[PDB]
From Swiss-Prot, chain A:
It comes from the Bacteria. Residues 116-138 are annotated as: Disordered. Belongs to the bacterial ribosomal protein bL19 family. Residues 119-138 have a biased composition (Basic and acidic residues). PANTHER family: LARGE RIBOSOMAL SUBUNIT PROTEIN BL19M, RIBOSOMAL PROTEIN L19. It comes from Thermus thermophilus (strain ATCC 27634 / DSM 579 / HB8). SUPFAM superfamilies: Translation proteins SH3-like domain (SSF50104). Coiled coil: none annotated. GO terms for cellular component: cytosolic large ribosomal subunit. Contacts the 16S rRNA of the 30S subunit (part of bridge B6), connecting the 2 subunits. GO terms for biological process: translation. The gene is rplS. One of its GO terms (molecular function) is structural constituent of ribosome. This is Large ribosomal subunit protein bL19. Pfam families: Ribosomal_L19.
UniProtKB/Swiss-Prot annotation, chain C:
It comes from the Bacteria. Pfam families: Ribosomal_L17. Part of the 50S ribosomal subunit. Contacts protein L32. This is Large ribosomal subunit protein bL17. One of its GO terms (biological process) is translation. Transmembrane segments: none annotated. Coiled coil: none annotated. It comes from Thermus thermophilus (strain ATCC BAA-163 / DSM 7039 / HB27). Gene3D superfamilies: Ribosomal protein L17 (3.90.1030.10). InterPro entries: Ribosomal_bL17, Ribosomal_bL17_sf. GO terms for molecular function: structural constituent of ribosome. PANTHER family: LARGE RIBOSOMAL SUBUNIT PROTEIN BL17M, RIBOSOMAL PROTEIN L17.
Curated annotation (Swiss-Prot), chain D:
Part of the 50S ribosomal subunit. Residues 1-29 are annotated as: Disordered. The gene is rpmF. InterPro entries: Ribosomal_bL32, Ribosomal_bL32_bact, Ribosomal_zn-bd. Keywords: Ribonucleoprotein, Ribosomal protein. Belongs to the bacterial ribosomal protein bL32 family. Residues 1-22 have a biased composition (Basic residues). GO terms for cellular component: large ribosomal subunit. GO terms for molecular function: structural constituent of ribosome. This is Large ribosomal subunit protein bL32.
UniProtKB/Swiss-Prot annotation, chain E:
The gene is rplC. The keyword Iron does not apply. Belongs to the universal ribosomal protein uL3 family. This is Large ribosomal subunit protein uL3. One of the primary rRNA binding proteins, it binds directly near the 3'-end of the 23S rRNA, where it nucleates assembly of the 50S subunit. Part of the 50S ribosomal subunit. Forms a cluster with proteins L14 and L19. SUPFAM superfamilies: Translation proteins. One of its GO terms (biological process) is translation. GO terms for cellular component: cytosolic large ribosomal subunit. It comes from Thermus thermophilus (strain ATCC BAA-163 / DSM 7039 / HB27).
Length: 138, 122, 117, 59, 205
RNA sequence: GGGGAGGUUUGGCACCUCGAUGUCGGCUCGUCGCAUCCUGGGGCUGAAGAAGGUCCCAAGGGUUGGGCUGUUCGCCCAUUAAAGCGGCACGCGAGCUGGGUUCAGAACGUCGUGAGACAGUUCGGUCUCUAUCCGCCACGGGCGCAGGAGGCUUGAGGGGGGCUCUUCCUAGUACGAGAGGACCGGAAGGGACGCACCUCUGGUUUCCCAGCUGUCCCUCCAGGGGCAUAAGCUGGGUAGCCAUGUGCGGAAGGGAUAACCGCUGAAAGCAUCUAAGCGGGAAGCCCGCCCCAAGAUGAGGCCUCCCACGGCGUCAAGCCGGUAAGGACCCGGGAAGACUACCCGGUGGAUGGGCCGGGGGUGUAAGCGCCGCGAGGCGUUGAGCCGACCGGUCCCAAUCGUCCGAGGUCU
RNA sequence: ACCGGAGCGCUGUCUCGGCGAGGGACCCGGUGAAAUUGAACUGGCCGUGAAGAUGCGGCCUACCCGUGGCAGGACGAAAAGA
RNA sequence: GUGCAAGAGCACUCAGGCGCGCGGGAGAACCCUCGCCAAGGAACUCUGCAAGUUGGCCCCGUAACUUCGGGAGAAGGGGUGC
RNA sequence: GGUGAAAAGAACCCCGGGAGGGGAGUGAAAUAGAGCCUGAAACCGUGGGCUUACAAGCAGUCACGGCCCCGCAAGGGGUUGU
């Protein structure tokens, strides 16, 4: 009866980790979806990002993307609908974890305060064919 | 969040670019509006060369909220403003060219002719 | 459904942290100080946790010490003496307790803070 | 001076009834373990004190 | 007819089907059957259910340890459920199978002093325009000379908070036997460890 | 042409009120009356179905904003199930508004020769913190409860509850010229709403962090400190608290009944729902449904605990102290809270502070090297900093103990 | 720093209110008033009167008394009606 | 004194002075003064009334009409630290 | 406007920081004790004798009762439940 936490935490039948590692830089590829009358569609979601509410389980986060006309916002939760979801252009570098002043002035001013963390790419590529050495032994 | 003064915009080709919501054509004392309600908006501005003119009362289909509407599938979605199109006094929009994406919000309203024209869906 | 997270109040944020730090300075000067109860209560809380912070011995949290209070000389006294004592003492380094009669000039409760190693 | 001004004069009855609701209530004291003194509850008596023994200057 | 005791754990918006649903988990917990009640010898339809055991020293007294089956006394008492009568066994969770709505009585967070604007719902006054005297207040009350009385049962300012109330119709989603967690819809007042119980709902016909 | 009803409008009476009754309309808070706007219903039709005209019953609920309306009668658009009519001093300025009419200024008018006159006009222009009782909202202290006590009670009164609209399957069928278009039952939702939750939605968070400045400080640099608010300024914000977010509900069913639809049925060889009796019949009445609830002075019902005289009152009723079972104190505290009350734990111990660890917020700290003429930047370093939610943990704080506490009236 | 209309962009004026700061307002120890005041042991009510009843008749309930208050009654209070 | 264009205006601050002659807690409805807000942006209402935006310095610029000084520092906008 | 006839105006000692009291002496008198002849009522207090917590009030009066204390008797005080 004690640790009410551990109660609420063991309740987590959801432990979905079929996704890479991310940080407030970028993200890009795929989400999921339904659209057509009864599922059937794979509407991926590329682009950037915005906010991350990490309640552990209520890990839901809104994305910035920009659809032709203007821009779009969307909150997704980590644990089910977002099929493969897998990003690609992760990148990093942000002096904060709440990017909002972008919805203010947005175009090249973005790409200015937008930098990149090669670091992540480095360890990703290291882990790439160090897994060829994992296709060797251990 | 719309009311009988909420200045709102359009993303169509037809004529008007800005109007002002009058009512919601629903539960008449509701007034609050998200992606689905029906504003009988009064036209405010249009293009000086074409049909449909400034200041004619028009009925109107609603999209794009600025405080994300709570999605059934867990999520939450909104656009970059508060806007949509007109409905005419014999059902459907007097329009023909959408600018930018929509949501399946509209799809859940069952108005497909709009959605087939819709380039991106959310 | 009010004060739904607890605290002892009076004064204001500024004068709160002020007289906090004050009574805490004069505290760690004479080591043992006469006061009223509420003062003494959340004083012993704040000072308890604070003394945990003082227990260590790193530049970082030391600047942090004088980042809070004032004179660094008591920080001398603290590191070279208080740390080796409370080296084997964790989680309760202040004994502040009540007293009779009360502030016999306005009828306010009494208490006193002690060293306690 | 303004509005709610005593309609009439109150009775001594209701006066000292309003007064009656406040009978002066006594304090609380228990003895000190190893002495003769009625210290207030939980509190250490001015002299004597608690276990371990300290202060002791309330002649 | 049916029912079970419970404590509020959680509230999250789990993804059943593909959906965000408010899920309150209720640790019904070990609720042993003890004093059974009948009209003739007592008064009404009831049985007694002890939420969860944790009182040897700090309770004393008859103990329903005498009752017939010991079972000691819970951390907090056994209670007489309106409409309920089992066999002779400990009720916990599996008596409620996946896919049913139930009534749910809560004891909930008190507040104390409560104002009208969040008790009833009035219009406060001008944050500018007229008097800044009134700011937040209900305004008038009753009529002039006739009738003249502030009516009995009137809506006024005072207390609103800890109330004993049964809520109507909420689907039971799932059930856990090993630790004892019933999983249902999303509401339940009280603290995140406050007091709440299940009854059998009064559905359609 | 008759007579009546009701006292919302404009008048008659001047009878309380000129030993200060302060005003339309607007905001606020309602409550009622039904001669009823809408939803129920039923009969009638000069009622094909769809719709309408009329009368009667039927309040449980509902009845929008807006521009010119200051505004008495507005008007119109946009709605809506309809956008009810009225009593309540034209309900309600010791609740508010104050555009208003009735003050001194001042310009228009007008009438009189003029001081002045108006229910002719116009701009601005100073509504006196305090609750003595009843009334209402919750919070308590007294005593009852005819042995004393720790728990579980029934349900009577009383209260909340009672809204509507959209599309489809019937069925484009019956009906019918086609258009059109069904009763009934049913089936998915939104609005007005009541209830509750943080889970999501997005909100405050007063020191939880991070970048900036004028000044002054430590200590000269780095670094840090108040001052600029009663936080100097901004960026963000979990738990808590919060609505727009989020879940839940009105009904359903029974009983009698109205307006009304019918049976058997005579008085009177005919009739007749009525005279004897029966059926059906409303969102309405009561319950059913949710809240209060044993000062329901009826204090009721139930599990159990304890137990003579232990001492006078020789009869009558008590009295008197240690006790029983237990309790009251004080603390540590609290999702309890104005106090109270309510709840837990009390060295027997995880009750609070601290340690600690998880979550969580801030989002690579100071300090060393490296590089740059340098402000800064790079490795260190998603790191330093750490208020609530989850607890593992006795170091500090709940020591110690204080006082109170049945003797079971009576037939 | 005068008055009428209109838009521009900013707004808690309002939709519609929630959270936060002090000084309070709440319990304590010290010190403590006022205008007024025949009385009081002061209820709902349909009646009843110089026409507008806590008190008279009737009817009904509500055990005795007090804080924190909303301000409908006490035909208001204050200056013996503008 | 510093820094702010200048000054004595502003903030911080030198000497000087004061902690303003009752204190203390819990941390209500409500009140004074102030802070925030999703999304709407005068629907509030007697009217933008108050609050609210707007503020200094360098330039791009400034119409009708004029009695030539005006309107102008118009309006609308760009730039501001090391 | 007031001690007494005159100050003989309270020495010595006890509680207190004193202020005030407590024993004394004094004088006929010390509620003649220093603002001291009388010292009503309003108004504010102590014990105790009697009542009042099922109750609707110009609080008084009439019949009765219960209680406490005067009365030898009968009586009577007064308390005030119906």
């Amino acid at each position: 009866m004690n640790r009410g936490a551990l109660i609420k935490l063991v309740e987590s039948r959801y432990v979905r980790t079929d996704l890479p590692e991310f940080r407030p830089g970028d993200t890009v590829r795929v989400s999921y979806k339904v659209k057509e009358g009864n599922r059937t569609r794979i509407q991926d979601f590329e682009g950037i990002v915005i906010r991350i509410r990490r309640n552990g389980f209520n890990t839901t986060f809104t994305v910035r993307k920009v659809s032709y006309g203007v821009g779009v916002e969307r909150i997704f939760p980590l644990h089910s609908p977002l099929i493969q979801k897998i990003d690609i252009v992760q990148r990093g570098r942000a002096r904060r974890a709440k990017l909002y002043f972008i919805r203010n002035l947005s175009d090249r001013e973005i790409r200015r305060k937008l930098r990149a963390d090669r670091k992540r790419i480095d360890q990703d590529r290291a882990a790439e064919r160090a897994a060829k050495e994992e296709a060797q032994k251990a | 969040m719309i009311q009988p003064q909420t200045y709102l915009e359009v993303a169509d080709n037809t004529g008007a670019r800005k109007i002002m919501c009058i009512r919601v054509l629903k539960g008449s004392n509701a007034k609050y509006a998200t992606v689905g309600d029906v504003i009988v908006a009064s036209v405010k501005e249009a293009i000086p060369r074409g049909a449909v003119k400034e200041g004619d009362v028009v009925k109107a289909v609603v999209v794009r909220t600025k405080k994300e509407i709570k999605r059934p599938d867990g999520s939450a979605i909104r656009f970059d403003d508060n806007a949509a199109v007109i409905i005419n006094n014999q059902l459907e929009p007097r329009g023909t060219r959408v600018f930018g994406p929509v949501a399946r919000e509209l799809r859940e309203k069952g108005f497909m002719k709009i959605v087939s024209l819709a380039p991106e869906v959310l | 459904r009010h004060l739904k997270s607890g605290r002892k109040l009076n004064r204001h944020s500024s004068h709160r942290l002020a007289l906090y730090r004050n009574q805490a300075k004069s505290l760690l000067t004479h080591g043992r100080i006469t006061t009223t109860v509420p003062k003494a209560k959340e004083l012993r809380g704040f000072v308890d946790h604070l003394i945990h912070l003082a227990k260590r011995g790193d530049l970082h949290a030391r600047r942090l010490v004088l980042r809070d209070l004032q004179d660094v000389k008591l920080v001398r006294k603290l590191f070279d003496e208080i740390a080796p004592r409370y080296r084997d003492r964790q989680g309760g380094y202040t004994r502040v307790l009540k007293l009779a009669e009360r502030r016999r000039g306005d009828g306010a409760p009494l208490a006193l803070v002690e060293l306690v190693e | 001076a303004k509005h709610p001004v005593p309609k009439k004069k109150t009775s001594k009855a209701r006066r000292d009834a309003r007064r009656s609701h406040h009978a002066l209530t006594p304090p609380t004291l228990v003895p000190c373990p190893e002495c003769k003194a009625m210290k207030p509850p939980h509190t250490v008596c001015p002299e004597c004190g608690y276990y371990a023994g300290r202060k002791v200057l309330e002649v | 007819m049916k029912g079970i005791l419970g404590v509020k754990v959680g509230m999250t918006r789990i993804f059943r089907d593909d959906r965000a649903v408010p899920v309150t988990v209720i640790l019904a917990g070990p609720c042993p059957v003890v004093q059974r009640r009948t009209p003739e010898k007592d008064g009404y339809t009831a049985v007694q259910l002890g939420f969860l055991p944790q009182n040897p020293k700090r309770v004393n007294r008859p103990l329903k340890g005498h009752f017939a089956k010991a079972g000691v006394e819970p951390v907090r008492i056994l209670r007489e459920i309106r409409d309920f009568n089992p066999e002779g066994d400990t009720v916990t969770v599996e008596i409620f199978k996946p896919g049913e709505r139930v009534d749910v009585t809560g004891t909930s967070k008190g507040r104390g002093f409560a104002g009208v604007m969040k008790r009833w719902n009035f219009a406060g006054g001008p944050d500018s325009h007229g008097a800044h005297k009134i700011h937040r207040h209900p305004g008038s009350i009753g009529n002039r000379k006739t009738p003249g009385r502030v009516y009995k049962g009137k809506k006024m300012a005072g207390h609103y908070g800890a109330e004993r109330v049964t809520v109507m119709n909420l689907e039971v989603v799932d059930v856990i036997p090993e630790e004892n967690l019933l999983l249902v819809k999303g509401a339940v007042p009280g603290p995140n460890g406050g007091l709440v119980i299940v009854r059998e709902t009064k559905k359609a016909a």
